């Protein structure tokens, strides 16, 4: 009993053949404490998954969003895919490890996986914790 990988059910529900998929454009990404992830107006591309440790986006002299363990950092919609930027500031108050991909490196492999994938797209509300709008 504990944090299973199915953060991500469209490979966890995937034959490791998917994941192989993944895989081959797997991405991780690292935040340290007080840490600068993002800068207003970044450009997002892929979307991140925190298994442990404390971060949030600052803006406005307040966090504009407040996540911690099991988070999920990026907007949803995945299947509109659009150009999106984080116009706050992101900001790791804790170590934390995140794991992220380019969402054409997933829709790609996925792509290997038509049922899957096209599911992944409104799968992935299954998750969606923090929703991250442009401006």
Not at 41 to 62: H, P, R, W
Not at 84 to 96: G, S
Request: aromatic share 8%.
């Amino acid at each position: 009993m504990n944090k299973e990988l199915l953060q991500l059910p469209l490979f966890e529900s995937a034959s490791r053949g998917c994941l192989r998929s993944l895989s081959l454009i797997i991405k991780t990404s690292f935040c340290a404490p007080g840490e600068f992830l993002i800068r207003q107006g970044d450009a997002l591309q892929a979307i991140y998954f925190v298994c442990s440790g404390s971060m949030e986006v600052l803006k406005d002299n307040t966090v504009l969003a407040i996540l911690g363990k099991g988070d999920l950092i990026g907007s949803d919609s995945l299947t509109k895919e659009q150009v999106i930027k984080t116009n706050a500031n992101v900001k790791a108050l804790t170590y934390c490890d995140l794991q992220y991909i380019s969402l054409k490196g997933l829709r790609e492999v996925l792509r290997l996986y038509p049922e899957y994938a096209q599911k992944f797209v409104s799968e992935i509300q299954h998750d969606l914790t923090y929703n991250l709008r442009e401006g």
